[PDB]
């Protein structure tokens, strides 16, 4: 029942090709943030240039090619405003973005956690787009683009009714510490991490 | 402010 002993790659910088279904190989470079306890094949990765956190079975997915774990070391970045950061956690927020034409575009959301590994970054999700995002929110805050407002189900299966008249099954993979009724869900055949209040 | 990525 043996398997090749591997270095734990959480915290590592990686790069790899990805075989698009009936398409070209695309190239990806990112940071491994986490290895999911209930499914150790599954990693959460923040890719450079992509706002969404993705979940991939990096060593198992046959679409991954030329996976390279880099020696590049992620900086042990001390937190500038530990106080401000710590208090944003679990808070509802109004997060200001910019449109194509530069017009304002405000999104209601919730700050979930400081991200592991890239710890000047934050986990955040949105009321109108409930997947896991990741930004350096202290920057948005300082620039006035982030306004703050005043048992575990992990391991269980959930079914969601797809808007295109269909159903799918996911696993509850993580409980948000600051808000224990909020969980991360991973569905098969979807790379996004869904964030739902399960109470 | 940040630019929203329309695809993801």
UniProtKB/Swiss-Prot annotation, chain A:
Chain positions of site Histone H3K4me3 and H3R8me2a binding: 129, 136, 140
GO cellular component: chromatin; cytosol; nuclear membrane; nucleolus; nucleoplasm; nucleus; spindle
Keywords from the named record: Acetylation, Cell cycle, Chromatin regulator, Developmental protein, Isopeptide bond, Meiosis, Nucleus, Phosphoprotein, Repeat, Ubl conjugation, Wnt signaling pathway
Domain of life: Eukaryota
UniProt-annotated stretches for the region Tudor-like domain 3: 153-199
Region (Tudor-like domain 1): 9-72
The name this protein goes by in its record: Spindlin-1
Portion held of the full protein: 45 to 259 of 262
Swiss-Prot record, chain B:
Domain of life, source organism: Eukaryota
Modified residues (N6-methyllysine): 4
Location of Symmetric dimethylarginine modifications: 8
Modified positions (5-glutamyl serotonin) in chain numbering: 5
Residue numbers of 5-glutamyl dopamine PTMs: 5
N6,N6-dimethyllysine PTM sites in chain numbering: 4
PTM annotation (Phosphothreonine): residues: 3, 6
Family under the similarity heading: Belongs to the histone H3 family.
The protein's role, per its UniProt record: Core component of nucleosome. Nucleosomes wrap and compact DNA into chromatin, limiting DNA accessibility to the cellular machineries which require DNA as a template. Histones thereby play a central role in transcription regulation, DNA repair, DNA replication and chromosomal stability. DNA accessibility is regulated via a complex set of post-translational modifications of histones, also called histone code, and nucleosome remodeling.
Description of how the protein assembles with itself and partners: The nucleosome is a histone octamer containing two molecules each of H2A, H2B, H3 and H4 assembled in one H3-H4 heterotetramer and two H2A-H2B heterodimers. The octamer wraps approximately 147 bp of DNA. During nucleosome assembly the chaperone ASF1A interacts with the histone H3-H4 heterodimer.
The protein, known as: Histone H3-7
Organism: Homo sapiens
Source lineage: Eukaryota, Metazoa, Chordata, Craniata, Vertebrata
Encoding gene per record: H3-7
Entire-sequence positions represented here: 2 to 9 of 136
